[PDB]
Amino acid sequence: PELPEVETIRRTLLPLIVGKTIEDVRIFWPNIIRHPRDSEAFAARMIGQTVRGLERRGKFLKFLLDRDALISHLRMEGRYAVASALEPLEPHTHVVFCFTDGSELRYRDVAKFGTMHVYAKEEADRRPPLAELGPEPLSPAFSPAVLAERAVKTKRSVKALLLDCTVVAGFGNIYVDESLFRAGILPGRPAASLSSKEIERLHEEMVATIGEAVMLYVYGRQGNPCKRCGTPIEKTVVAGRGTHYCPRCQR
DNA sequence: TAGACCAGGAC
DNA sequence: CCTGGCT
Ligand SMILES: [Zn+2]
Numbered sequence: 726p727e728l729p730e731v732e733t734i735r736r737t738l739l740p741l742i743v744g745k746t747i748e749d750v751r752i753f754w755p756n757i758i759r760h761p762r763d764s765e766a767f768a769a770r771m772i773g774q775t776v777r778g779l780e781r782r783g784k785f786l787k788f789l790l791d792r793d794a795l796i797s798h799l800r801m802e803g804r805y806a807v808a809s810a811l812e813p814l815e816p817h818t819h820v821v822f823c824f825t826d827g828s829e830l831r832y833r834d835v836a837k838f839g840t841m842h843v844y845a846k847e848e849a850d851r852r853p854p855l856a857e858l859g860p861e862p863l864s865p866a867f868s869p870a871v872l873a874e875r876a877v878k879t880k881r882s883v884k885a886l887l888l889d890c891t892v893v894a895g896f897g898n899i900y901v902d903e904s905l906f907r908a909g910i911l912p913g914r915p916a917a918s919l920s921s922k923e924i925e926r927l928h929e930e931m932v933a934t935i936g937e938a939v940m941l942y943v944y945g946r947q948g949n950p951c952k953r954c955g956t957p958i959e960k961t962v963v964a965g966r967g968t969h970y971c972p973r974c975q976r
Numbered sequence: 977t978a979g980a981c982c983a984g985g986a987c
Numbered sequence: 988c989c990t991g992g993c994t
Contacts, residue, residue: 756983784991800983800991838983838990854992881977890992898990965979966990 726799728862728895729938731784734805738786739779741807745824746775747790754819757834760842760853767843771795771822783858783895787849794849796842797832803839806831859893862935867893869928876916876924883919883927884912885964896935899944902969904931906943911975912968943969 726734750768758764770793778789788795797803806815810827820832820841832839844852860866875892876883886892887901896904905912907930910923919927942952947960947969956973 798991801989836984836989840983857992879977885977888991895991 726784726803727897727899727938728781728784728935731786731799731895732781732939734799735779735781735786738805738807742776742788742824742830743778744775745826745828747771747773747822748825749823751821751823752819753821754834754837757819757832757837757839757841759840760844767841770843782855783861783890784897785855785858785895787855789846792845793843794846796844796849796855798840798854799834800836800838800840802836803832803834806833857891859889859891862893862896862931863939867928867932869925872928873921873924876919879916881916882912882964883910883914883916884966884968886916887931888964888966893931896931898966899941900931900934900938902944903942904934906969906971906975907934909975912963912970943971945969 750771752758752764752768755764758767761767771790774790774793776788776790780787780789784798786797788797807828807830810823810829814831815833817835818831818833819837822830840854842854849855860871875886879886884901884905887896902912904927908927910919910927943958946958949958950956951958951971951974954971954973956971958969958971960967960969962968
């Protein structure tokens with residue numbers, strides 16, 4: 726899931742678990758548990774805690790309990806559902822939190838790429854995987870000034886800058902390409918080559934793009950006509966990822 | 977800072 | 988070979 730989807734999950738999952746008390750935690754693929762390393766410790770510490778909240782940080786979900794925070798990354802295929810303890814589990818269910826009311830929070834992940842870290846709440850933000858995460862794209866903390874300051878300090882591409890989680894939190898490939906298109910900037914441009922007016926336009930489109938999705942011009946459209954100028958959208962490789970852009974609209 | 981690395985299986 | 992985030 727991308728940031729906007731994770732936010733949707735955060736928003737809808739919360740009412741379904743808030744105020745529920747954990748009675749058991751069952752783990753069927755321990756490698757998903759990253760901290761504590763020992764999955765039995767992970768399971769033992771959660772038992773008895775009540776769910777008090779659910780926040781999002783980039784693409785990470787942060788379940789807030791009484792004493793601990795559970796940091797969860799879905800990666801590709803991770804998904805959460807709330808259902809009855811009386812019904813059979815669906816396939817690829819790897820972690821289940823059982824509540825005292827007979828309902829369960831189930832984690833499914835065909836890829837088994839997702840991760841879970843538990844820490845005392847007060848230290849979750851200074852530990853992996855949250856420790857170095859950049860500001861929320863939709864928050865005041867992520868401003869043109871902040872982007873500009875990171876821009877003029879690096880030699881790498883503007884796309885690579887935007888994909889850097891330390892620069893801005895959870896800005897996916899899709900939204901990087903779309904935002905660059907809307908800002909009229911080639912993904913291959915050196916971040917330092919961007920003008921004050923460009924970084925400002927980029928910031929504005931970043932916020933608008935992710936903001937609209939939370940509440941496609943180029944991504945996956947290669948071969949197809951640009952929606953603004955009719956030029957065939959191109960796809961190459963930039964900073965490891967597939968990169969989509971209009972050779973005419975973007976400079 | 978550029979890749980390499982890696983979670984696990986898919987075709 | 989697909990993909991976000993240690994050498
Ligand atoms: Zn165009």
